[PDB]
Enzyme design. Structure first.
Site, PDB file in Angstrom:
ATOM      1  N   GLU A 178      -9.943  19.998  28.408  1.00  0.00           N
ATOM      2  CA  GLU A 178     -10.603  19.065  27.477  1.00  0.00           C
ATOM      3  C   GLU A 178     -11.189  19.751  26.225  1.00  0.00           C
ATOM      4  O   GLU A 178     -11.052  19.242  25.126  1.00  0.00           O
ATOM      5  CB  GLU A 178     -11.753  18.307  28.168  1.00  0.00           C
ATOM      6  CG  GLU A 178     -11.357  17.260  29.186  1.00  0.00           C
ATOM      7  CD  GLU A 178     -10.843  15.980  28.617  1.00  0.00           C
ATOM      8  OE1 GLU A 178     -11.268  15.621  27.549  1.00  0.00           O
ATOM      9  OE2 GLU A 178     -10.019  15.312  29.235  1.00  0.00           O
ATOM     10  N   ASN A 199     -10.650  10.268  16.902  1.00  0.00           N
ATOM     11  CA  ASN A 199      -9.419   9.491  17.180  1.00  0.00           C
ATOM     12  C   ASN A 199      -9.246   8.435  16.095  1.00  0.00           C
ATOM     13  O   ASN A 199     -10.209   8.087  15.413  1.00  0.00           O
ATOM     14  CB  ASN A 199      -9.378   8.881  18.611  1.00  0.00           C
ATOM     15  CG  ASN A 199     -10.717   8.416  19.102  1.00  0.00           C
ATOM     16  OD1 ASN A 199     -11.365   7.720  18.404  1.00  0.00           O
ATOM     17  ND2 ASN A 199     -11.156   8.854  20.270  1.00  0.00           N
ATOM     18  N   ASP A 255      -8.738   5.244  16.055  1.00  0.00           N
ATOM     19  CA  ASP A 255      -9.583   4.055  16.265  1.00  0.00           C
ATOM     20  C   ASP A 255     -11.029   4.134  15.715  1.00  0.00           C
ATOM     21  O   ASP A 255     -11.716   3.110  15.675  1.00  0.00           O
ATOM     22  CB  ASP A 255      -9.619   3.669  17.754  1.00  0.00           C
ATOM     23  CG  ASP A 255     -10.247   4.687  18.620  1.00  0.00           C
ATOM     24  OD1 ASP A 255     -11.112   5.428  18.177  1.00  0.00           O
ATOM     25  OD2 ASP A 255      -9.928   4.722  19.784  1.00  0.00           O
ATOM     26  N   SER A 311     -13.580   6.143  16.854  1.00  0.00           N
ATOM     27  CA  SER A 311     -14.518   6.753  17.787  1.00  0.00           C
ATOM     28  C   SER A 311     -14.318   8.269  17.774  1.00  0.00           C
ATOM     29  O   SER A 311     -13.320   8.768  17.257  1.00  0.00           O
ATOM     30  CB  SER A 311     -14.319   6.175  19.215  1.00  0.00           C
ATOM     31  OG  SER A 311     -13.135   6.619  19.883  1.00  0.00           O
ATOM     32  N   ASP A 319     -14.852  11.958  20.329  1.00  0.00           N
ATOM     33  CA  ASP A 319     -15.077  12.552  21.644  1.00  0.00           C
ATOM     34  C   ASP A 319     -15.891  13.829  21.458  1.00  0.00           C
ATOM     35  O   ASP A 319     -15.540  14.666  20.620  1.00  0.00           O
ATOM     36  CB  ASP A 319     -13.742  12.875  22.320  1.00  0.00           C
ATOM     37  CG  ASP A 319     -12.788  11.654  22.407  1.00  0.00           C
ATOM     38  OD1 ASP A 319     -13.210  10.498  22.178  1.00  0.00           O
ATOM     39  OD2 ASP A 319     -11.599  11.892  22.714  1.00  0.00           O
ATOM     40  N   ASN A 337     -16.584  10.039  25.181  1.00  0.00           N
ATOM     41  CA  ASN A 337     -16.245   9.125  24.069  1.00  0.00           C
ATOM     42  C   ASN A 337     -17.441   8.302  23.530  1.00  0.00           C
ATOM     43  O   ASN A 337     -18.233   7.778  24.299  1.00  0.00           O
ATOM     44  CB  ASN A 337     -15.153   8.116  24.476  1.00  0.00           C
ATOM     45  CG  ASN A 337     -14.014   8.735  25.128  1.00  0.00           C
ATOM     46  OD1 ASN A 337     -14.254   9.606  25.946  1.00  0.00           O
ATOM     47  ND2 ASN A 337     -12.779   8.309  24.795  1.00  0.00           N
TER      48      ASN A 337
END
Length: 129
Positions: free
Chosen positions: A35, A46, A48, A50, A52, A59
């Site tokens: 990760e 990302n 969209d 959002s 991480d 998220n």
């Protein structure tokens, strides 16, 4: 911070992640590796809109308040910047809320693709704690 493998394993052991909700410590270390590459300052945007955050790439749409993600929840009840601290306490605390849902560790895609079903024991071997 960039954690060493056994440094992080000891850290997460002390936070009670070993066998937490039936997931052995090896899978938490494996997840962190793929990760974040053990990088506590890691961030991923990302498309969209959002983001991480941190050692476990949690998220912003569901888990933390970023002030930048529209129509969002913060189920872990934190500012998302807390997941970028050199101390892993906030990230472990929020992750424990995540795996308690019913989907388990499938929440993390890198776990799902590179760890699930493998010999995760390898990720704590050659460590003291």
């Amino acid at each position: 911070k960039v954690f060493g493998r056994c440094e992080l394993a000891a850290a997460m052991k002390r936070h009670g992640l070993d066998n937490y909700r039936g997931y052995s410590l090896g899978n938490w270390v494996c997840a962190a590796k793929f990760e974040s590459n053990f990088n506590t300052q890691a961030t991923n945007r990302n498309t969209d809109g959002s983001t991480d955050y941190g050692i476990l790439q949690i998220n912003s749409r569901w888990w933390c308040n970023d002030g930048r993600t529209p129509g969002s929840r913060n189920l872990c009840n934190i500012p998302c910047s807390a997941l970028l601290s050199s101390d892993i306490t906030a990230s472990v605390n929020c992750a424990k809320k995540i795996v308690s849902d019913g989907n388990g560790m499938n929440a993390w895609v890198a776990w799902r693709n590179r760890c699930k079903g493998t010999d995760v024991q390898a990720w704590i071997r050659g460590c003291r704690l």
